[PDB]
Design a binder for this molecule. Structure first.
Ligand SMILES: NC(=O)CC[C@H](NC[C@H](O)[C@@H](O)[C@H](O)[C@H](O)CO)C(=O)O
Ligand SMILES: [Ca+2]
Length: 241
């Protein structure tokens, strides 16, 4: 049978993204990796699904939740912030990561949120960054990008003054392009990352939640967090109790 309500009962089809390093990304061989991928794989194993039974498809961020809602994938995993607005379209698992939205700029760029008034700020279409900047960065010219790589290329070229993306990805790009630096950190603890599932696949949602709680309780979450986000604080909520 099919208790988890999957497209194929023998395989879990996961929608993800290739350029949200270190949450979710492709290595040079094309394989999907990163914290969110390794955490999902660990949770999927607890559900009785081996690595070979989980298939990852890379999509632009804006395509992920409509793809799950339209039955193209069973799950979506790509640091997808849990919000009321997104809960109208899709269901979410319990939160597994809460952190900052970050403004990445050039070596002689912006210093604070005030510095963004009248500047060109890059954003990935469909992200929480795009909503935040529309509500809190009025006067900043928002330049929409399909993904992080194109936005960083524009930032490196001087097309845009800054780029608004997730903290760990901003941190990763500042390591890959040493001239880049994080100028502003905005709290996004009210929107923790959750695995996205079809409205309302209660079986898969409850199964994902159980696997997540287990991975946090046995220190698996802690181990992956230490591996992918070195130096980032881990709250007691996601650590063993
Ligand atoms: N580009 C992406 O993959 C996702 C970007 C963006 N992530 C927001 C995060 O989920 C943020 O709210 C979290 O608190 C945390 O820092 C990482 O999941 C979003 O959901 O739109
Ligand atoms: Ca553009």
């Amino acid at each position: 049978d099919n208790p988890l309500g999957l497209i194929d009962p023998t395989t879990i089809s996961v929608g993800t993204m290739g350029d949200a390093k270190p949450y979710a990304f492709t290595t040079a061989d094309g394989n999907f990796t990163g914290f969110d991928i390794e955490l999902f794989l660990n949770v999927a194993g607890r559900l009785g699904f081996k690595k070979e039974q989980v298939v990852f498809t890379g999509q632009e961020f804006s395509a992920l939740m409509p793809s799950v809602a339209n039955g193209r994938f069973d799950v979506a995993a790509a640091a997808i912030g849990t919000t009321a607005k997104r809960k109208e379209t899709v269901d979410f698992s319990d939160g597994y990561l809460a952190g900052f939205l970050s403004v990445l700029t050039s070596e002689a760029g912006i210093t604070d949120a005030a510095g963004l008034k009248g500047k060109r700020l890059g954003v990935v279409q469909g992200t929480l960054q795009e909503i935040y900047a529309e509500k809190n960065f009025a006067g900043t010219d928002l330049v929409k990008f399909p993904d992080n790589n194109s936005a960083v290329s524009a930032l490196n070229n001087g097309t845009v003054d800054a780029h608004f993306l997730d903290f760990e990805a901003a941190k990763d790009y500042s390591a890959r392009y040493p001239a880049l630096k994080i100028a502003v950190n905005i709290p996004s603890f009210d929107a923790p990352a959750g695995f996205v599932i079809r409205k309302g696949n209660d079986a898969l949602r409850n199964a994902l939640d159980k696997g997540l709680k287990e991975a946090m309780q046995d220190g698996t979450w802690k181990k992956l967090h230490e591996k992918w986000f070195p130096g980032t604080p881990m709250p007691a909520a996601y650590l063993p109790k």
